[PDB]
Amino acid sequence: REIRFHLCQNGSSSAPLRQFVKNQIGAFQKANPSTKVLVREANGVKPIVFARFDHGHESKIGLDVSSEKEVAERVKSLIE
Protein backbone atom coordinates (compact mmCIF):
# COMPACT_ATOMS: atom_id res chain seq x y z
CA ARG A 1 0.00 0.00 0.00
CA GLU A 2 1.00 3.60 -0.42
CA ILE A 3 -0.79 6.82 0.40
CA ARG A 4 -0.65 10.18 -1.28
CA PHE A 5 -2.27 13.41 -0.33
CA HIS A 6 -1.60 16.70 -2.00
CA LEU A 7 -2.30 20.10 -0.57
CA CYS A 8 -3.11 23.56 -1.73
CA GLN A 9 -1.12 26.25 0.04
CA ASN A 10 -3.93 28.76 0.24
CA GLY A 11 -4.90 29.47 3.83
CA SER A 12 -8.53 28.53 3.30
CA SER A 13 -9.47 24.85 2.90
CA SER A 14 -5.91 23.66 3.58
CA ALA A 15 -5.04 24.80 7.13
CA PRO A 16 -6.66 21.59 8.48
CA LEU A 17 -4.47 19.59 6.11
CA ARG A 18 -1.54 21.94 6.79
CA GLN A 19 -1.58 21.64 10.56
CA PHE A 20 -2.31 17.96 10.12
CA VAL A 21 0.70 17.32 7.93
CA LYS A 22 3.00 19.44 10.08
CA ASN A 23 2.33 16.94 12.87
CA GLN A 24 1.19 13.53 11.73
CA ILE A 25 3.73 12.27 9.21
CA GLY A 26 5.77 11.01 12.14
CA ALA A 27 2.53 9.36 13.19
CA PHE A 28 2.11 7.81 9.74
CA GLN A 29 5.49 6.32 8.92
CA LYS A 30 5.96 5.17 12.50
CA ALA A 31 2.42 3.82 12.20
CA ASN A 32 3.03 2.38 8.72
CA PRO A 33 6.70 1.79 7.93
CA SER A 34 5.93 -0.42 4.94
CA THR A 35 3.24 1.86 3.52
CA LYS A 36 4.85 4.75 1.65
CA VAL A 37 3.54 8.24 2.21
CA LEU A 38 3.92 11.11 -0.19
CA VAL A 39 2.69 14.70 0.01
CA ARG A 40 3.32 16.69 -3.11
CA GLU A 41 1.50 19.92 -4.07
CA ALA A 42 1.59 23.61 -3.39
CA ASN A 43 -0.51 25.42 -6.00
CA GLY A 44 -4.26 25.97 -6.04
CA VAL A 45 -6.05 22.62 -5.90
CA LYS A 46 -8.75 20.76 -3.97
CA PRO A 47 -7.83 18.96 -0.75
CA ILE A 48 -8.17 15.26 -1.50
CA VAL A 49 -6.49 12.33 0.24
CA PHE A 50 -5.73 9.39 -1.97
CA ALA A 51 -4.75 5.92 -0.85
CA ARG A 52 -3.89 3.02 -3.04
CA PHE A 53 -4.06 -0.56 -1.89
CA ASP A 54 -1.19 -2.85 -2.74
CA HIS A 55 -2.77 -4.34 -5.89
CA GLY A 56 -3.59 -1.54 -8.34
CA HIS A 57 -6.68 -0.37 -6.49
CA GLU A 58 -7.26 3.35 -5.97
CA SER A 59 -9.27 5.01 -3.23
CA LYS A 60 -9.98 8.63 -2.40
CA ILE A 61 -11.91 11.04 -0.29
CA GLY A 62 -12.00 14.80 -0.24
CA LEU A 63 -10.83 16.38 2.97
CA ASP A 64 -13.03 19.51 3.12
CA VAL A 65 -13.24 20.77 6.69
CA SER A 66 -12.56 19.79 10.28
CA SER A 67 -10.07 21.96 12.15
CA GLU A 68 -8.28 18.76 13.04
CA LYS A 69 -9.20 15.30 14.43
CA GLU A 70 -11.63 14.25 11.71
CA VAL A 71 -9.03 14.66 9.01
CA ALA A 72 -7.29 11.71 10.66
CA GLU A 73 -10.64 10.00 11.12
CA ARG A 74 -11.32 10.21 7.38
CA VAL A 75 -7.75 9.03 6.74
CA LYS A 76 -8.30 6.01 8.99
CA SER A 77 -11.58 5.47 7.15
CA LEU A 78 -9.60 5.44 3.90
CA ILE A 79 -7.30 2.80 5.39
CA GLU A 80 -10.47 0.86 6.12
Binding residues for another protein (CB under 8 A): 2, 25, 36-42, 52, 54-56
- CB 39 to another protein: min, Å: 5
Q: Which is nearer to another protein, 37 or 61 (CB)?
A: 37
Q: Which is nearer to another protein, 25 or 65 (CB)?
A: 25
- CB 54 to another protein: min, Å: 8
Task: Pick the closest to residue 5 from 54, 73, 76, 61 (CA basis).
Answer: 61
Q: Which is nearer to another protein, 4 or 74 (CB)?
A: 4
- Burial label for 48, CB within 10 Å (0-12, 13-18, 19+), is middle
Question: Do residues 39 and 6 lie in contact, with contact meaning Cβ atoms separated by under 8 Å?
Answer: yes
